[PDB]
RNA sequence: GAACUGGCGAUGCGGGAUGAACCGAACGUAGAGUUAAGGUGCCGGAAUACACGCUCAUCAGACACCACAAAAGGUGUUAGU
RNA sequence: UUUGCUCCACACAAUAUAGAUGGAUACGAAUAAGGCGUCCUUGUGGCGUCGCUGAACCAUAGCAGGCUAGCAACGGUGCACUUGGCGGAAAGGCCUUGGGUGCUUGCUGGCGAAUUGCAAUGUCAUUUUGCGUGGGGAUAAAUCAUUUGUAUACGACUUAGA
């Protein structure tokens, strides 16, 4: 069909931070269609991919992935905390990430 | 705090050889928990009689539940409170279904209209008004009229989403 | 104190029809039609029996109920305007210089022209509002009559005429000269 | 959800709308705001005109052309409110600001696009009834905006064209609903009703 | 010749008014207003649906267009008796408001296979609807 | 210029925008969890939360140290004697 | 001024992405009111119905979507070719007419898929640019130097010169 999506759309908002100090090791992700920590609990442990393009082919591709996972809920409005094997670049504040349905408990 | 309970606290002077079996003074205290209830009891016994917590004893503390929590009553409330430049006695009327809820409303109302904290207020007396024509405040009397009914114009509906596609209406 | 419900009654005579959409009020009587916009009050209008209109405020404060009674007065004034109309009579007060007042056309527009006020060389002009008719009353000296269906227009035009003749740089207790509203009444009054 | 969100600024409160839009742009949503001249500010017109005159009198003493700039158009007053709500001196804030377009009226191609509202910034939902409020086009005109009348003329003729479009769409909607009425009580309709459709 | 004034009907906060609770332990059940406490609080009772007699804030509930005759301050047993006598439940179920609510839960409870069947049925209905829309 | 104690000096860290001394808390290198003081419209991480009231200012108000205000007065509005 | 320049199409190569991954799905007003349908005597009209969120609507099935046989209706969609009409606020889009050409999951069949080995975006978009191929199109200027003085510190300005 015209749709092939098997992931949930997400947006990289910022690092974990206080007013004036940020923590690049933890990222804050807004998952589309999630408005409460109760709903965000379904996504805990789900794998996250940041998919970007580069001019240089490396291993047969110009597409590169940064892999991570949802670790806990954040705040009251369905935002979650996520950790990646390498921290997100921080120019991706506002960029789109993919939250897959694996590992699945349903 | 505003989730008030009502306690009876009964205490007495510490018994001695000259006066065994003292007189078992009792108060009704509106407080959020028993610790505060006992403290308020000792504060008031401190102010009225020549007794203190060290030379006294608490023999009983019991929560008093509302007899008919689902019966709308009118409450006369006599309070004494401290303003920024004096002490004043007031009478107020609360339409509510329980004494603890009426006292909650009283504390909110004193804080709102007179900037009086819980620190500054003495609850002299809370008493149900047994019948109408004894209700003295018009802001309570206006709710006692026969076949009372009023609309709620300009209903504002809370949106779960940032954006709306429909220009909401306020009909109700 | 947020009174639960405040209400006023508007009596509509036999030959008058009142049509009130949201807050746009139209009153049609034998003498004509008037329209008032009342979208600044937040009141509720109810028709009872084709002779009575109730106007109400729900959960309203002191200022809100004051505005409610003001709205009742305004609608009553429009009904009175279409039934019997308003007439303001003004007198000319002068000590030495006869105040000359006339109606002139500048370009298809009626103007009240005032000359010789305190011996001035300045000709004062006051536009005549729509629905306001001016007549210089005979059989009584120095009187001008403004009549119309809206007390707002009649009274405002009379006030403009009164204010165009204010004395400057004099003791106005002594120089009492001017044109003053002497009577506020109705056209057909009985 | 949609790639570009077009907000009809009519009847919104400037600060609450600006806060919403600032968060959207910083989160990566592209926003176009139309009809900025119909935006509202709480408080009476005289009071908001006094506030803008206080803003006008602030200028660099030794050279006025390098001082605070006082933009008069309603779209720029809204843009200024959204700045200061955005960290505009950084690359990220600049990137957020290129995600925003603000207009007076509804110019093309947005005049044929769907417009949305932000309920948490709507005046009718937010302000207490009876509280006085200001209209942005009127405040801007009193401050020195030059184009209130041309915008009003263009809005009137756009409203005419939109009215004929709506009449055609309403006629087609009526006949589509009529056809869907004939589809009822059929077996497919009964099954869809059982399944929830 | 006839004075005309737009009525502007509102649902009235009154004894016997049916409300639909939207937040709390009830959260979606019908109750009746038995007595008015103040401009913002009323005493409600939902005996048939399991809503306990309680003082509630008017912001927690939405007034429905349904009303039934009820004496002020009626106790739970008489509220239940008059609710059943007035047959509030099916008069509520017949309204499109309740139909819309039921449609929302039915859609929420669908399975993946049921959603696929919905797609197939929708395409089948669409074929005939477009055919008739072209004919007429 | 003295008294007691706690500090700064000799000290970073979170908060008070900013600041030697205030609040919180004192420091090896990291991970995770939880908090303090302070906050949660946006800048800015976190409820445009919930609840009862009050206030409309043609010079509103908006958190201690602290970056001031008085005598006096008002059928503004609210509660009360 | 090197067979230079420009537009169109396809072929390759490079370049990057503030961040596609079903659809930005178009009345205007009011909110102490409105929307829609219907009827009449056409109104600030009567009647009915609706909202209480887009949790909608539309799209949605097929080797990332293959090959093939039919049934039923003459519908739905894509591509060029089209007949016009409208749109200047930044129009650059919207509404159309008529055939052709594919697809159709509206309904019944038949064949294919495997081993990417239990997952690895598993590559399916679109700015820009250059080098090629084959098809149209057009055939200048500015600056320096000289010159004027309506200009001028120098630049600049303003004039003139096949
Ligand atoms: Mg200028
Ligand atoms: Mg030293
Ligand atoms: Mg400070
Ligand atoms: Mg500090
Ligand atoms: Mg301390
Ligand atoms: Mg803040
Ligand atoms: Mg935030």
- Which domains are delineated in chain D? 1-147 (3.90.1180.10), 148-197 (1.20.5.4280)
Q: How far apart are CA A66 and CA C130, in angstroms?
A: 77
Q: Which residues contact B122 (CB under 8 A, 6 or more apart)?
A: B79, B80, B81
- Cβ atoms within 10 A of the Cβ of E87, count? 10
Is B162 close to D118, i.e. CB distance below 8 A? yes
Residue with tokens 């907000």: D7
Distance B114 CA to F81 C1' (A): 15
Report the side by side order of strands in the sheet with C86-93. C133-136, C143-148, C86-93, C178-186
Report the side by side order of strands in the sheet with E41-46. E51-57, E41-46, E30-36, E17-21, E61-67
Chain E residues touching C64 at Cβ < 8 A: none
Q: How far apart are CA A23 and CA A83, in angstroms?
A: 11
Strand G nucleotides within 7 Å of a protein CB: 14-34, 36-38, 43-46, 49-62, 64-65, 73-76, 87-94, 105-107, 120-125
CA closest to G20 C1', residue: D3
Is E4 close to C20, i.e. CB distance below 8 A? yes
Mind telling me how many Å the CA of E8 is from chain C's nearest CA? 8
Please state the domain extents for chain A: 1-106
Neighbors of chain E by Cβ distance (3+ pairs < 8 Å): B, C, D
The domain made up of A1-106 has a fold known as: Thrombin, subunit H (2.40.10)
Is C19 close to E5, i.e. CB distance below 8 A? yes
Report which secondary-structure segment, H or E, holds A67: strand A63-74
Q: How far apart are CA E53 and CA E32, in angstroms?
A: 9
Tell me the ligand closest to A19's alpha carbon. 7
Is C58 close to B151, i.e. CB distance below 8 A? yes
Interface A-D: count of C-beta contacts within 8 A = 15
Q: Identify which of C1, C5, C42 has the shortest CB distance to residue B150.
A: C5
- Under DSSP, the state recorded for C129 is P
- Report how far ligand 4's centroid is from the alpha carbon of A23 (Å): 21
Experimental method: cryo-EM
For residue B155, the chain D residue with the least C-alpha distance is D125
- Cβ atoms within 10 A of the Cβ of C116, count? 15
Residues E43, E74 contacting (CB under 8 angstroms):
no
Q: How far apart are CA C115 and CA C80, in angstroms?
A: 35
Distance D98 CA to G127 C1' (A): 16
**Would you call the peptide bond into A103 cis, given omega within 30 degrees of 0 as the criterion?**
yes
β partners of residue A31: A10
The domain made up of C1-85 has a fold known as: Outer Surface Protein A; domain 3 (3.90.930)
Distance D113 CA to G135 C1' (A): 40
For residue A11, the chain D residue with the least C-alpha distance is D27
β partners of residue C91: C143, C180
Q: Do the domains spanning C1-85 and C86-190 agree at the CATH topology level?
A: yes
Burial string for D38-72 (b: 16+ CB within 10 Å, else e) reads bbbbbeeeeebeeebeeeeeeeeeeeeeeeeebeb
Residues A97, A48 contacting (CB under 8 angstroms):
yes
Resolution (A): 2.2
Specify the CATH number of the domain C86-190. Answer: 3.90.930.12
Q: 3-class SS at E62?
A: strand
Is C45 close to E2, i.e. CB distance below 8 A? no
C-alpha angle E60-E63-E66 in degrees, rounded to nearest 5: 145
Q: Residue D92 CA to chain centroid, in angstroms?
A: 24
Distance A79 CA to G113 C1' (A): 41
Please state the domain extents for chain C: 1-85, 86-190
Ordered alpha helix ranges (H), chain A: 37-40
Q: Which residues contact C33 (CB under 8 A, 6 or more apart)?
A: C26, C27, C82
The CATH class that applies to domain E12-94 reads mainly beta
Q: How far apart are CA A93 and CA A13, in angstroms?
A: 5
Tell me the ligand closest to D146's alpha carbon. 1
């Amino acid at each position: 069909a015209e749709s092939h999506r098997l992931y949930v759309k997400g947006k990289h908002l910022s690092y974990q931070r206080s007013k004036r100090v940020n923590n690049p090791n933890v990222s804050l992700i807004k998952i589309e269609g999630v408005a409460t920590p109760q709903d965000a609990q379904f996504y805990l442990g789900k794998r996250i991919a940041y998919v970007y393009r580069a001019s240089k082919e490396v291993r047969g591709s110009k597409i590169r992935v940064m892999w991570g996972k949802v670790t806990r809920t954040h705040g009251n409005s369905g935002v979650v905390r996520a950790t990646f094997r390498n921290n997100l670049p921080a120019k991706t504040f506002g960029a789109s990430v993919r939250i897959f349905l694996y590992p699945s408990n349903i | 705090m505003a989730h008030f309970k009502e306690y009876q606290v009964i205490g007495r002077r510490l018994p001695t050889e000259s006066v065994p079996e003292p007189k078992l003074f009792r108060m009704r205290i509106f407080a959020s928990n028993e610790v505060i209830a006992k403290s308020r009891y000792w504060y008031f016994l401190q102010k009225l009689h020549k007794v203190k917590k060290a030379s006294g004893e608490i023999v009983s503390i019991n929560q008093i539940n509302e007899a008919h929590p689902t019966k709308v009553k009118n409450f006369g409330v006599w309070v004494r409170y401290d303003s920024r430049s004096g002490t004043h006695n007031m009478y107020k009327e609360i339409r509510d279904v329980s004494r603890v809820a009426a006292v909650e409303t009283l504390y909110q109302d004193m804080a709102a209209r007179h900037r009086a904290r819980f620190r500054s207020i003495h609850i002299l007396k809370v008493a149900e008004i047994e019948k109408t024509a004894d209700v003295k405040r018009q802001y309570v009397k206006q709710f006692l009229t026969k076949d009372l009914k009023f609309p709620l114009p300009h209903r504002v509906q809370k949106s779960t989403k940032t954006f709306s596609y429909k220009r909401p209406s306020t009909f109700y | 104190m947020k009174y639960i419900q405040t209400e006023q009654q508007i009596e509509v005579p036999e030959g008058v029809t009142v049509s009130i959409k949201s807050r746009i009020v139209k009153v049609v009587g034998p003498r004509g039609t008037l329209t008032k916009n009342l979208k600044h009050i937040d009141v509720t209008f109810t028709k009872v029996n084709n002779q009575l209109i109730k106007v109400a405020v729900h959960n309203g404060g002191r200022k809100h109920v004051a505005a409610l009674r003001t709205v009742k007065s305004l609608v009553d004034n429009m009904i009175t305007g279409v039934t019997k109309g308003y007439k303001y009579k003004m007198r000319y007060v002068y000590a030495h210089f006869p105040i000359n007042v006339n109606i002139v056309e500048k370009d298809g527009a009626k103007f009240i022209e005032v000359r010789n006020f305190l011996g001035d060389k300045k000709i004062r002009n006051v536009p005549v509002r729509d629905g306001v008719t001016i007549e210089f009353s005979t059989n009584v000296k120095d009187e001008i009559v403004l009549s119309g269906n809206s007390v707002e227009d009649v009274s405002q035009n009379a006030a403009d005429l009164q204010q165009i003749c204010r004395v400057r740089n004099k003791d106005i207790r002594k120089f009492l000269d001017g044109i003053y509203v002497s009577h506020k009444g109705f056209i057909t009054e009985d | 959800v949609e790639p570009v969100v077009v907000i009809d600024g009519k009847g919104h409160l400037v600060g609450r709308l600006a806060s919403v839009v600032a968060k959207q742009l910083l989160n990566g949503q592209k926003i176009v705001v139309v009809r900025a001249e119909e935006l509202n500010i709480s408080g009476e017109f005289f009071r908001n005109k006094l506030k803008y005159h206080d803003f006008l009198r602030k200028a660099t003493a030794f050279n006025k052309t390098r001082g605070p700039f006082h933009f008069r158009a309603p779209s720029r007053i809204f843009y200024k409110a959204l700045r200061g709500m955005v960290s505009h001196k950084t690359a990220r804030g600049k990137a957020a600001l290129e995600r925003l377009k603000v207009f007076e009226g509804i110019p093309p191609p947005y005049d044929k696009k769907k417009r949305v509202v932000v309920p948490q910034a709507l005046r009718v939902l937010r302000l207490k009834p009876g509280r006085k409020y200001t209209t942005l086009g009127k405040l801007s005109t009193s401050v020195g905006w030059k184009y209130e009348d041309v915008v009003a003329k263009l809005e009137a003729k756009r409203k005419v064209s939109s009215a004929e479009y709506y009449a055609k769409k309403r006629a087609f909607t009526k006949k589509v609903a009529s056809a869907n009425a004939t589809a009822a009580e059929s077996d497919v309709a009964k099954q869809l009703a059982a399944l929830g459709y | 010749t006839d004075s005309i004034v737009k009525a502007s009907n509102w649902r009235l906060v009154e004894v016997g008014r049916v409300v639909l609770i939207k937040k709390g332990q009830s959260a979606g059940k019908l109750a009746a207003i038995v007595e008015i406490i103040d401009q913002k609080k009323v005493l409600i009772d939902g005996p048939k649906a399991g809503v306990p007699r309680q003082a509630i804030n008017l912001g927690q509930v939405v007034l429905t267009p349904l009303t039934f005759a009820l004496p002020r301050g009626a106790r739970t047993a008489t509220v239940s008796k008059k609710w059943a006598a007035a047959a509030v439940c099916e008069k509520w179920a017949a309204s499109s408001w309740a139909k819309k609510i039921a449609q929302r839960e039915r859609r929420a409870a669908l399975t993946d296979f049921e959603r696929f069947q919905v797609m197939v049925l929708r395409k089948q209905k669409r074929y005939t609807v477009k055919k008739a829309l072209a004919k007429a």
